[model samples]
Target: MYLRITNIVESSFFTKFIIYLIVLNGITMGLETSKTFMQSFGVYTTLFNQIVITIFTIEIILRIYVHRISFFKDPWSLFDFFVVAISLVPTSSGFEILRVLRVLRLFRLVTAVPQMRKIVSALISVIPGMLSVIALMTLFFYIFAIMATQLFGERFPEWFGTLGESFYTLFQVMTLDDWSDGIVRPLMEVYPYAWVFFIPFIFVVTFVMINLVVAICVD
Candidate 1:
């Protein structure tokens, strides 16, 4: 068996073991988020992750070595390759934005068990539309912000005095939060027909906002 470790690696795919290891790694990564846990189990966490990363690398690494030429034929294997490859990264202290890649390996569960692949790629396809919706929302918010600054800025300084102030107030209004009693009711104390603008603004924004937002999950 010294000549080839190939067949052995095939059996070591460790289906259930991989699943448990992935779940275990995810738990530690999440647990690291808690300050109390980190303080108590600091060194232990460091070692746990090293061992986790070690096995993940060996499994994926040798599997690729054995089948490097034909290994990338499966999308699942490619995903596993990149996720495992990214996890092995050792980041420097100054910019650990790169360290976030380690946590990203947690998402390998998608293909690890094939819980539901189509909907995610389907959502990715609609990203352009979602991004377009975001661009238009900015334009829409700006238009109303300018309108409010001109209309209310003269009378109401706290909520709509400056253009940015109006933008902030309108954003609060958009969210159906404290807009009515907190902001609008105070305005209606002086302007009776405020509903004409406020109600129309509510429906107009949330209408477009929710439909596209809803479109994302509907399918």
Candidate 2:
């Protein structure tokens, strides 16, 4: 019977049904977030939530029975176990946060779908490259931030008042979020050639480094 249950769970129809259930649960959770929906169809939402939890609990039990102690050895199996386990926690005023976290169950979709699994694995594999680029980006930001603090700190105390403030301003510049009209233009009014500092900063951080990070991830 356990072997039969394992084969059934691994069947395409069973996987598809679970994926559909996950999607339905996600939709119900989103509906619960709406004040009007909850006020009117709240009972239906409650019914669906209870039913989904029961199904997931049964599914987890079946998987554990099939896999035995080996179930805990698989990370994805452990993840699904915890996701279902957390939903069983009794809701109370003190545990309101758990209500919000129930949405995390939607992430089980990633494990359910093979493509998502591969994509997530690819991203995880690129973490070392991301870290190296991130460190270099931080160092570059620090150097420019120090320069900005010393050069413009006295003039524009609001934005470049200290090392932390200048670092923040430069980060804003890096994102190209109104850097010219909002930050640089005002500074240029005093220094007249402030673009020398900002234009290159934008080129490096926004254009070069950002694209390099993407390239690393894609590769």
Name the candidate that leads on TM-score.
Answer: 2
Q: How far is 66's C-alpha from truth in model 2 (Å)? A: 4.0
- CA deviation > 4 Å runs, candidate 2: 1-8, 11-13, 61-75, 78-98, 142-169, 187-197, 210-218
Which regions of candidate 1 fall more than 4 Å away from where they truly are? 1-16, 33-36, 57-92, 95-102, 122-135, 145-171, 185-197, 210-219
TM-scores for the candidates: 0.59, 0.69
Which tens-of-lDDT digit does each residue in 1-219 have in candidate 1?
522767666554565678788889898898999999999997898899889888988878777777886879977788888887776667566467667878878777776665446666665778876887888889998998998888777789899999999999999998888998898888888778777878989998989888897978764
Candidate-wise lDDT, in order: 0.81, 0.87
| Winner by lDDT | 2
Candidate 2 lDDT over 126-213, as tens digits, reads 8776776778889999999999999999999989999999998998887778898999999999999899988988888877666776
lDDT of 2 at 183: 95
What are the root-mean-square deviations of the candidates from the true structure over C-alphas?
5.5, 4.1
Residue pairs that clash (backbone atoms under 3 angstroms), model 2:
none
